[PDB]
Design a protein around this ligand. Sequence first.
Ligand SMILES: Nc1ncnc2c1ncn2[C@@H]1O[C@H](COP(=O)(O)OP(=O)(O)OP(O)(O)=S)[C@@H](O)[C@H]1O
Ligand SMILES: Nc1ncnc2c1ncn2[C@@H]1O[C@H](COP(=O)(O)OP(=O)(O)OP(O)(O)=S)[C@@H](O)[C@H]1O
Ligand SMILES: Nc1ncnc2c1ncn2[C@@H]1O[C@H](COP(=O)(O)OP(=O)(O)O)[C@@H](O)[C@H]1O
Lengths: 582, 87
Amino acid sequence: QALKKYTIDLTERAEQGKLDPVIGRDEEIRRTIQVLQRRTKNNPVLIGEPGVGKTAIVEGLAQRIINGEVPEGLKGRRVLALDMGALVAGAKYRGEFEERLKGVLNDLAKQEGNVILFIDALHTMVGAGKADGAMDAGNMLKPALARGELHCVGATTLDEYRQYIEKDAALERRFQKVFVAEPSVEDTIAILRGLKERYELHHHVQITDPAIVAAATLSHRYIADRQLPDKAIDLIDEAASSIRMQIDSKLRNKVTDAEIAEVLARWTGIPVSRMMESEREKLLRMEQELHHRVIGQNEAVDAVSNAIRRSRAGLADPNRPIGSFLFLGPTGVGKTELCKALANFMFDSDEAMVRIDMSEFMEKHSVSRLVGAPPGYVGYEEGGYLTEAVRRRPYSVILLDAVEKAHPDVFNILLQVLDDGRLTDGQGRTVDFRNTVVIMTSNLGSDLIQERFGELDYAHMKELVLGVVSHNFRPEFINRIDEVVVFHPLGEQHIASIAQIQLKRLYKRLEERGYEIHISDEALKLLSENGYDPVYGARPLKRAIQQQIENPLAQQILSGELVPGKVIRLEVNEDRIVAVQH
Amino acid sequence: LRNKVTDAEIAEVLARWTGIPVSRMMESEREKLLRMEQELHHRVIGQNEAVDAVSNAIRRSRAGLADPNRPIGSFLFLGPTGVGKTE
Ligand SMILES: Nc1ncnc2c1ncn2[C@@H]1O[C@H](COP(=O)(O)OP(=O)(O)OP(O)(O)=S)[C@@H](O)[C@H]1O
Ligand SMILES: Nc1ncnc2c1ncn2[C@@H]1O[C@H](COP(=O)(O)OP(=O)(O)OP(O)(O)=S)[C@@H](O)[C@H]1O
Ligand SMILES: Nc1ncnc2c1ncn2[C@@H]1O[C@H](COP(=O)(O)OP(=O)(O)O)[C@@H](O)[C@H]1O
């Protein structure tokens, strides 16, 4: 009949057992039954945020009907998953949709109060038969709803509920709101323990139950895209397919929690991966790798090494971010170099990061540049720069440079940030900063540091510059810092080592060009004499390397003088540096 | 345990309807509620003033003596930086 054409019996499928076991949801199914045994407006609607198991509530109710675990008034009923695409499709003629829907309604009256109706996507039922001068499904179902003589069950997302049903109050009051919350962690672990049998029967592999509880735990903590139980189910399924292809292509036979971590790190790259000996010996050689690019300035290397080790070691403060820092020193001591060193350690690249230089924000209102603009105003549909740049890749490094340049009340934003890792952009959603490192640099007591780094300890220098910082900032803000570090002007040996590093990357780029070039150490001594001052550090070394290398060497390369394969000693002139061809 | 419909039944349905706790006090909830001053001091130690104050506020809610035109808690916490206001 017409019920055969447009409806699908879920209860016959659960009678075949071809539906999923549904475990839990007891108050939700009980209130759904309480609404379904009424006199007027029998119709519960499963308002719940997208992917918390709303279809599975009705499927589990169908299974409880088949098992006979319902009250006596529901024993022997039929749940029919109504189809909207079956009804819209065949009707470009006038009245043909209304013909079908009225025939369905007369069949449902004919079934004598035995058919439970399930309508997935109730928001699809709203704009259903919207042809020019045509009733939708609302204008035809709406009689039989509030006489109680239809046993509809809605299932809709809450954002679809606002736009598509709360806009139409008449059909909005015909139903009964059933909030279906995202489950907490422990109950989701229980549900996943229920569903282990299905995936074991599907992929013929086994699952570690610690991997299950780790998938639920890490999914609730780190992934902010989807919602429970959906994200954890997808973790388990994708791990199962990965193990199946590891076996079948070319080891193991189960699904460990390390496989869960590999799935999560493949999905984003938050380094939940366990400390393998390459990674763990890398992490124990933290300061050694930081002094592969940054000579000197030991104490901040120590502090950030400590913070990243406490992050990776499973001792993360789960609400504050990784490290809430503050760098302080005179101009040109490689503060940005240390930040690029962290980026290169973490991501194998300097500019795989976000640097936002706060000298651009010397006015107040650029707060709205990084957090966005409210509803109504100009740049609403774009988001703040900082929030979006986190919202793509949350495991990153957020760098603020020249923090003395901006207005003091930009730093209520970072009060939020360093309190909880939370930030709310102009559209009004939270952005998790629990995988970020915040570094702020200034040159506050640079006169005081250049004056008194000699003949003083590190500690009371930090004390005195902290007093200067309290003269600068707010007591709220500097409480949020994990650790304030102090930089110092470098000796000439540090600048000679930096010149060695610049010669290393120069010879790297000239082997890329294809030239075997060496240097006299006297030329290194002359370059150390040239770009040196205690007041400015190595940016004079930058310009000295720039001029006295990049001008004559590249001038003689383009002069046809430098032949590849020749030994090229960068020896000295009387006042300059000369290359040879030997 | 019942055969009729009472007003506490309506309170149970209305609490399952919106969220607001209008159901009459089961003894686990009420005995948890009396210790509210004690129960806050397992995460906020010290600052007895607003702990007792807010416990008084939520007791004014659940007992039923709230102002039915004004919200329950209308507080202004004031304290130095890091003494557990947010906590
Ligand atoms: N209590 C539960 N017991 C067993 N499986 C569950 C339970 N809750 C959710 N699931 C599973 O979670 C997965 C997704 O739930 P679904 O109901 O299919 O998604 P959904 O509720 O339709 O969400 P939308 O609205 O389609 S985005 C399915 O594989 C369900 O089997
Ligand atoms: N009485 C307390 N009991 C327990 N933890 C406390 C207490 N007072 C402060 N804390 C700690 O305070 C930290 C956060 O305090 P907050 O309330 O955020 O600071 P605050 O009270 O908001 O002050 P400001 O000006 O906003 S920084 C948490 O990490 C708690 O551990
Ligand atoms: N320890 C160091 N290691 C490597 N390069 C350095 C170091 N100190 C200074 N430099 C050079 O000096 C410059 C200092 O950069 P930056 O940290 O931006 O200076 P500032 O201290 O003003 O922030 C860098 O561009 C870099 O080339």
